[PDB]
Ligand SMILES: Cn1cnc(S(=O)(=O)N(CCN(Cc2cncn2C)c2ccc(C#N)cc2)Cc2ccccc2)c1
């Protein structure tokens with residue numbers, strides 16, 4: 001009816017149809033702290049909201065009032081709760097409410113309350129037929145919106161809508177191969193479909209990643225993904241990996257590639273490999289290069305690693321103190 | 324030497340830390356480059372102005388900003404009308420870090436206000452007459468503990484608090500944030516925080532909680548809001564901190580976690596980002612860097628012999644430089660990044676992170692690093708609760724005088 005931003009908007013204390021209700025002022029005490037100097041509009045709407053909440057008045061006019069209270073502060077979870085009471089109590093059409101919530105999310109996409117409200121609606125209606133497309137629109141304006149991706153995972157999982165998501169992931173990786181949210185979604189989809197034990201799948205995934213690394217050697221997301229999908233079984237389980245990375249040293253180097261090498265050596269030393277000692281020194285050499293030159297921001301981390309490797313892999317590590 | 328620049332961000336080698344975009348441009352690299360350009364100007368301003376740099380924490384300015392806020396806020400804070408206990412917490416903790424005493428009239432007035440925020444059925448709301456919610460509940464408890472008087476302690480209705488927690492507990496180990504609300508790792512932390520401080524932890528309250536949190540650690544090493552989500556500094560702090568409280572840190576892969584967080588520090592800016600391939604932000608000086616004192620304590624409990632005895636496993640110098648040079652508003656208060664406006668949230672957590680970076684401690688070992696003038700040194704903070712370590716001990720002891728509700 002009367003929009004909050006309308007030029008003809010009128011305070012509630014000046015509305016005839018509200019003449020029967022006494023507004024309820026906020027009880028901040030005799031000497032307030034962190035007291036907010038509300039505007040006229042704000043204080044007026046919430047004085048009247050407190051009245052209807054207090055009376056538990058479940059009416060059409062109360063329903064409309066919650067829209068204005070939400071507009072003034074969409075983070076007010078108490079107002080949201082009352083609104084959901086009114087939705088059920090008044091038997092309100094839920095698709096109309098879907099239309100409403102999608103508009104609010106469009107304009108305030110980084111708010112917890114609005115996404116949770118959409119979820120409850122979808123739960124009530126048991127209808128996910130609009131979700132993937134709506135979320136896609138939000139992601140088109142901010143491809144990393146945390147609430148958006150969370151809602152997408154919930155919808156896909158609860159309603160088993162897996163069949164097209166990998167295609168969607170590939171599309172977004174094209175637009176921005178640096179989008180960590182998308183690399184996460186890729187892992188999410190594969191984990192819950194084929195899994196990573198299927199050698200054909202794992203093989204495919206590594207080729208693609210190495211590809212991308214070749215195209216953009218300094219993109220950390222690709223590096224983390226490659227590490228993430230190989231580290232559970234153990235890096236040393238893949239003997240060809242080492243040489244192939246070393247072969248990128250010349251024209252594809254990065255502190256990322258160096259760090260990976262250290263991870264390979266670390267695992268190798270853990271699974272009792274050949275040349276115990278030769279491998280150790282190679283690693284300490286790299287740990288030093290990183291801490292002193294190539295990645296000094298993490299000097300404290302790299303010194304710790306080098307110190308750990310020494311503590312447990314030196315030829316003297318198992319040698320008794322008496323020897 | 325005379326030619327040696329004592330500031331890490333200003334050294335000539337530092338220029339090599341700029342972004343390399345491999346001549347492939349995307350939205351991510353473009354936005355990252357914008358930030359680095361803005362930060363570079365801040366660093367270079369002394370050289371172009373022909374002045375010797377001086378890093379001063381504007382104590383007096385920040386104090387005035389807080390002192391006023393504790394009483395009154397402009398309508399700019401209407402969007403926080405449902406988080407007023409948070410405002411109490413952020414401001415009190417800031418004053419505490421700055422070592423400013425809390426007048427007893429202020430303390431009593433804070434207590435009375437929080438009483439009005441407390442629900443008849445347990446927990447605190449965002450304001451008087453608002454339903455209870457775990458986030459403002461966490462904030463309220465922390466504020467009363469900072470005050471630490473008998474009056475403050477008595478405000479909390481312990482029986483109801485426990486009842487409230489129970490009504491939120493899920494069969495799978497998680498907690499709702501509030502009745503008819505959503506679930507994520509923050510709620511576990513909020514619950515564990517207030518429950519431990521007030522001594523209301525029953526044998527079954529946190530059944531399955533450590534396991535549910537462990538399901539939130541992902542392929543990146545860090546922790547997401549719910550199982551399957553991208554790893555984030557905010558959720559990671561909440562997860563590890565909750566586990567520490569429950570004495571279950573070992574349920575996590577601490578090694579992959581350590582590698583993840585240390586990688587979150589920006590090589591050029593010196594501050595922390597919240598997730599891979601996004602932007603630096605002052606508040607992560609606590610959420611992210613605060614993880615390192617937690618890991619240190621955990622790894623040490625496992626007898627890790629390789630642990631340094633004087634420094635956390637991040638660049639303490641560079642973080643202090645970022646905060647002092649880039650995160651202060653001249654008129655008082657701190658902020659996200661240059662070009663952003665001040666607020667009490669970033670004031671709280673920038674200072675919290677600064678303290679972490681100044682103070683190292685592990686049992687008997689103690690070592691400080693204070694960049695800029697020595698007056699910059701702040702009071703220390705507890706890495707789990709983010710209040711004064713003394714206030715934590717004081718509170719826990721006091722409530723141990725009471726029996727867990729129901730005996
Ligand atoms: C985007 N984001 C980054 N951290 C978070 S959060 O911890 O969950 N948080 C962030 C809300 N948030 C946004 C924010 C924080 N750092 C950067 N941003 C944009 C925010 C909240 C309060 C103030 C004040 N004063 C200023 C900013 C939530 C929140 C809201 C109210 C009370 C407590 C937490 C959100």
Ligand SMILES: CC(C)=CCC/C(C)=C/CC/C(C)=C/COP(=O)(O)OP(=O)(O)O
Nearest residue numbers: 146458509512557558597598601602604610
């Ligand atoms: C106890 C408690 C309430 C703790 C707070 C934990 C915390 C900091 C959570 C942040 C969650 C979030 C929505 C991040 C993304 O925001 P963004 O995408 O705008 O920021 P980003 O780009 O830096 O990730």
Ligand SMILES: [Zn+2]
Nearest residue numbers: 604605606659
């Ligand atoms: Zn921030």
